[PDB]
Amino acid sequence: AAKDVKFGADARALMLQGVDLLADAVAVTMGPKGRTVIIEQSWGSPKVTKDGVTVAKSIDLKDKYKNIGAKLIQDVANNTNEEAGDGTTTATVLARSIAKEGFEKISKGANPVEIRRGVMLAVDAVIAELKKQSKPVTTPEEIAQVATISANGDKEIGNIISDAMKKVGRKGVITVKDGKTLNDELEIIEGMKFDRGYISPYFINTSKGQKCEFQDAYVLLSEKKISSIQSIVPALEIANAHRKPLVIIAEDVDGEALSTLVLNRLKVGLQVVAVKAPGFGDNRKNQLKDMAIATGGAVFGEEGLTLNLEDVQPHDLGKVGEVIVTKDDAMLLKGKGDKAQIEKRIQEIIEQLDVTTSEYEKEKLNERLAKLSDGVAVLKVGGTSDVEVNEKKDRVTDALNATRAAVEEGIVLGGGCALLRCIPALDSLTPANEDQKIGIEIIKRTLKIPAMTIAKNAGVEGSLIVEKIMQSSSEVGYDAMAGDFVNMVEKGIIDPTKVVRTALLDAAGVASLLTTAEVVVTEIPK
Template sequence: MAKQIKYSEDARASMKAGIDKLADTVGVTLGPRGRNVVLDKKFGPPQVISDGVTIAKEIELEDQFENMGAQLLKEAASKTNDVAGDGTTTATVLAQAIIREGFKNIAAGANPMALKRGIDTAVVTLRKAIGDMSQPVEGKTQIAQVASLSAHDEVMGDLIAEVMEKVGKDGVITVEESKGLEYEQEFVEGMEIDRGYISPYFVSNPERMESEIEDPYILITDKKVSAVADILPALENILKVTKNVVIIAEDIDGEALATLVVNKLRGTLNILGVKAPGFGDRRKAMLQDIAILTGGNVISEEVGRKLDSVEVADLGRARRVVSTKEDTTFVDGSGTEADIEGRINQIKAQIEETTSDFDRKKTARTIS
């Protein structure tokens, strides 16, 4: 398809028309008396919503020049959402006003670069002024007020305030659609990974289909364990101090899995095998997180360690480990506070640097 080219006022007018269409649609949701927008869905019923960035993401305009303007404004809303997590509608309305006045001044003969420098100077001044005027939200009551306003529901606001008070500022809150009519809340204590037990033979609570081990020693490796000879020396060392063992590995199968299951059923070992979470570099980072939390070491051939060299000092500890088919939770790991705090600071720095929304969310869950 041949490219179309526009210049000067003609180009600005087309882009501004697209900006206005998007901003006028998003802007109706702004403020305490903001209205909802209904989004048509290809699958399922229409969605009634008042979230600016969600509405903006749904807008695609037929005219390609207008659509370019809308996409630029959409980018501003998305960036605001990534950095602040809120304020997307306000950012959209402000951007529309800045663009409108900027185009007006350019049409009157103003230098575009001088306008840009003036906007940058104003931003610095305004940020300081807003910072001076801002009031930090403190206490459950104020959180409930803000949440109730955002959710348009006082009961939901109170629930969110209660949850935020419990999980703290670094906790992760996930909102999901309920299967019933009532609001429900569920707290996950400790560190949770999205991998469960390798075999149902490790289940210790058949009613809940869970495996729960109290005060286990935790062996962490990025290796796939198939031969019993690979893991036998480590198990012999572990059995000198405890029968409660959790093994986190890329996978456990064949002869090694059969041996662990037989010893579990005989009562020789109270053992649980869990698949390592994630893939590639992310897996390495998550295994290191588990090691720091539990005070253990990751046994990896990349650092010159093999399973037959495992000593009791290499193993992590936790007060309890609970595993289902889908996930595993480590409660009260024995890692030192200094190591855990150091890792948290490192993860926070990674969140600041990453440009991927997916990586940012996954990394934030690690801190929680």
């Protein structure tokens, strides 16, 4: 393919136009009063949504240079906000304004690097101030209050969340399931969690929410790679002989092993999924041992007695009541196994903790201890019929994720005030020269955009609401639902500091790249 190369301002100007279309398209859905977007679909009815991520993903421009500006933001704003959709539109709107102000100052003669440095300095002053203003959420009462708020007043949802937190701890694991009954309930079960997901999107099942779930599954464990290794079929034969799903945990999967598993998933309907091994080095081996004991299987490794995938017996695979695999996250719940062996391993880990002195080993040993001694909290959602249970299920999950985020980093005044109230942090920030000063001034002004954007979607002047907030006491913001100026702490209108902090850092990151890149290379269409 032949290329077409553009230089300097000529390329930057086009990428910036790609950004303006995208930012305007999703800015409109921001806040309590966001408006809808209608997305045409080719097979059925138009989709009508308020979701900032859906709208951002839907837009794809035909122009080769504007397409890049749009992807530079889409590949970050839609990818760094997996837990909640709140940070995507904030990062998109801030990145557009930072980049635009930078572009104008640079095309008039400011130095691209010195402007970038002034912006970084201002962003760090703001982040430190957000950390200073954030309040912790660790007390069971504090947790319940936040959970009730993120549950939008549904006190019963806030209460089952608080109870789950109390039962497994602030750092424990809480999941949500359909209870097949009328009442909501909390059950604690045995199981393991590790940060490794599916190796491929082709294994997605039950596609709403991009999940992959199996029950009564076999578990194949290995400390070795199966990349370009065949003869994985004997394990697949057992899964077919005894109609059970199979999950494969291996150091890596590629080549023929990958091809075999994906094609069977897609063309045969064989219920098999592969997941990467949970650790590194010696700790990888130790985690596989705990896992094998907990699931009642064996690890087909080389150390000690060598086991080969050429010969897999029904007693070599483990058994797990429920297996969940999602992007970068997997769980094994209700495993089968010998309780004497599990308790023995637990006692060994405790002795290892008592004996070792290294911080590294103690921390890893504590995680392995917890994997066998702690349980998993499950929130069972009930209701009259599945049509309604299915919606409540999401209300509970969103409340749960919001609660956990608040507990991990603390909370700040919401509705755009967390950043609006950090503007004074820049008053003591001193630049080395005029271009650094301009860079600080750019952030000082873009800190006002989230607050004005919400006021604009509400239907009132942005310039008046934002200035009036700043002129009042520290706990007063503007409530777009109430249509007035209220004490946000008393009202309970809060945002996790985690989200505010990330959205600003990501916006600054992309805008910086966008205004300093010098050469852009695109393909010539034919």
